[PDB]
Amino acid sequence: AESTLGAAAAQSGRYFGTAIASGKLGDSAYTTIASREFNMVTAENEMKIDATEPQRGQFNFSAGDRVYNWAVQNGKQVRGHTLAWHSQQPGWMQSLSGSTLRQAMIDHINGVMGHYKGKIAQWDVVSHAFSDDGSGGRRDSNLQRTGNDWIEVAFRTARAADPAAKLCYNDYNIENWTWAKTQGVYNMVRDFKQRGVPIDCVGFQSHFNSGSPYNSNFRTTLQNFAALGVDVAITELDIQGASSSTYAAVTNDCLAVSRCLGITVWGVRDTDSWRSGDTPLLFNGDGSKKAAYTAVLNALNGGGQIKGVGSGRCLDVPNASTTDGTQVQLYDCHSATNQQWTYTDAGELRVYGDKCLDAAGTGNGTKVQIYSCWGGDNQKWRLNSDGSIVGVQSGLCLDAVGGGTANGTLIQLYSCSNGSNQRWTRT
Ligand SMILES: O[C@@H]1[C@@H](O)[C@H](O[C@@H]2CO[C@@H](O[C@@H]3CO[C@@H](O[C@@H]4CO[C@@H](O[C@@H]5CO[C@@H](O)[C@H](O)[C@H]5O)[C@H](O)[C@H]4O)[C@H](O)[C@H]3O)[C@H](O)[C@H]2O)OC[C@H]1O
Ligand SMILES: O[C@@H]1[C@@H](O)[C@H](O[C@@H]2CO[C@@H](O[C@@H]3CO[C@@H](O[C@@H]4CO[C@@H](O)[C@H](O)[C@H]4O)[C@H](O)[C@H]3O)[C@H](O)[C@H]2O)OC[C@H]1O
Ligand SMILES: O[C@@H]1[C@@H](O)[C@H](O[C@@H]2CO[C@@H](O)[C@H](O)[C@H]2O)OC[C@H]1O
């Protein structure tokens, strides 16, 4: 299949997952999208230390099992997140140190992995162990103070607890190869593989924003780790602004690495995001697919003027007008600014530089025109591989009225039909 992210990824033996929040599983809109699009699930918080072991020796898997069962019942594998790390520790663990903390760490791993033995595809055994100070060294935490060998111990413990689970080291800001942090993790994993430490994968959270931007060398990082003999996975992907090109780029990086198991985005809709203000996911709050969604889908499926297939004519702004409200038409193709459209990372189709293909409504027959660019979803479009152009807000296709092919045929929104008057080719 190839109409959903999970199915499209499966074509190359990969998966496309999301982070599921137990509190949202009772949401029809949420579950409809989640069950349909993803085939891998990570509990957003339900399998962390404080959630699974509120009291030392007292385990609670109610919430974790709810997400797990929903995942398997709906055809998704599960990534366990996370067994040992400095964040979100229950109060009792936060105050522990030395040998007692080391024992608690081990006990926690055995308890949680034991409960889910043989049912977890990947476990983020250790997370966030390195610092952001630029030294490339370990971050100072109670776990690190128990001995630099805590990570190695965590992994050896995990292997014995559940030999069937792939064991991953997970962290953020380790995507750009030139960063010290990235190098620190690389050296650690290289050391582990050389000494036989049981580690099967490295998880790259991939939280990209202007503070820690995506860089094409992320592919190099993935390939360098893959060369060590470990699988790699994009575990908590979200991109500030949800740039279509960046989302497609990350997707293609995984597809370019045979050892990249799959990609998980950190959430379903922008409104479900831990950083909703960065509108970093693939679905809008109203549940509509964003421009980035189609960019990712096209990439998973194999991956100027806009000319209509059925008419052989180009999307044209009448008399090269720059007046807001001017409805677009079909017209003989020629070199003119009123026929030069630029698709942006935000999903707009710009003309004249600051004018945007705009839909003045959401129903059939809605006039497609130009209007000042401002970022509305009625100015954002999805470029399908089949040649159709779908409005984000409306979910409707650009359509040449009445199947018209002559000069002057107007453009409207209309239920997608795969008709030639709804298919376009970029020149
Ligand atoms: O419901 C919530 C859960 O969703 C949430 O999940 C955790 C989210 O992801 C992981 O934790 C976060 C990872 O990203 C960190 O922020 C980085 C910090 O560094 C920034 O870049 C810096 C820019 O300036 C430079 O000088 C510096 O060197 C750079 O590091 C980067 O842009 C940010 O994205 C967050 O602090 C982490 O919390 C974790 O795996 C998930 O479990 O957990 C909370 C829950 O409520
Ligand atoms: O995917 C399937 C759908 O395609 C199918 O319904 C199709 C919907 O599009 C139909 O063609 C439309 C008909 O309307 C034309 O525009 C109107 C022309 O007259 C004007 O007065 C009016 O204002 C315009 O809106 C549009 O250009 C043309 O593409 C097609 O015939 C239907 O079959 O339904 C089943 C779906 O699975
Ligand atoms: O007379 C006007 C037409 O000129 C206009 O369409 C233009 C035709 O010439 C082409 O070179 C232009 O690109 C195209 O916009 O449509 C409206 C009509 O009244």
The residues, ordered by sequence, that sit 6+ positions from 213 with a Cβ below 8 Å of its Cβ are: 176
- Catalytic residue from among 37, 44, 53, 236: 236
What single DSSP character describes residue 377? Answer: G
Distance CA 375, CA 156 (A): 50
| Range list of H helices, 61-197 | 62-73, 91-94, 98-115, 150-161, 180-195
Domain with 312 in it: 304-425
The residues, ordered by sequence, that sit 6+ positions from 160 with a Cβ below 8 Å of its Cβ are: none
Write out the two tokens for 404: 């018209």
210 & 70 share domain:
yes
Closest CA to 124 of 158, 89, 76, 87: 158
Angle between helices 218-226 and 244-255 (to 10 degrees): 20
347 & 211 share domain:
no
Point out the ligand nearest to the CA of residue 332: 3
Say how many C-beta atoms besides its own lie within 10 A of residue 334's C-beta: 10
Point out the ligand nearest to the CA of residue 422: 2
Strand runs labelled E in 298-365: 306-308, 314-316, 329-331, 342-343, 349-351, 355-359
29 & 106 share domain:
yes
Distance CA 251, CA 113 (A): 30
Q: Ligand 1 center to residue 174 CA distance, Å?
A: 12
Q: Ligand 2 center to residue 414 CA distance, Å?
A: 6
What pairing do the DSSP bridges indicate for beta strands 329-331 and 314-316?
antiparallel
Number of structural domains found in the chain: 2
The residues, ordered by sequence, that sit 6+ positions from 401 with a Cβ below 8 Å of its Cβ are: 409, 410, 411, 412
Find the Cα–Cα–Cα–Cα dihedral 323, 327, 333, 337, rounded to 10°. Answer: 20
274 & 336 share domain:
no
396, 415, 424: residue to mutate for ligand 2 pocket, most atoms within 8 A of CB: 415
Give the CATH number for residue 160.
3.20.20.80
What number does the ligand 3 atom closest to the CA of 408 have? Answer: 16
Evaluate whether 112 touches 52 at the Cβ level (below 8 Å): yes
Write out the two tokens for 4: 């959903």
Active site residue 236: yes
Find residue 53's DSSP bridge partners. none
Say how many C-beta atoms besides its own lie within 10 A of residue 173's C-beta: 20
Q: What is the 3-state secondary structure (H, E, C) of 210-232?
A: CCCCCCCCHHHHHHHHHCCCCEE
Does ligand 3 come within 6 angstroms of the Cβ of 210? no
Give the CATH number for residue 362.
2.80.10.50
214 & 250 share domain:
yes
Write out the two tokens for 17: 């997952």
289 & 324 share domain:
no
- PDB resolution in Å: 1.9
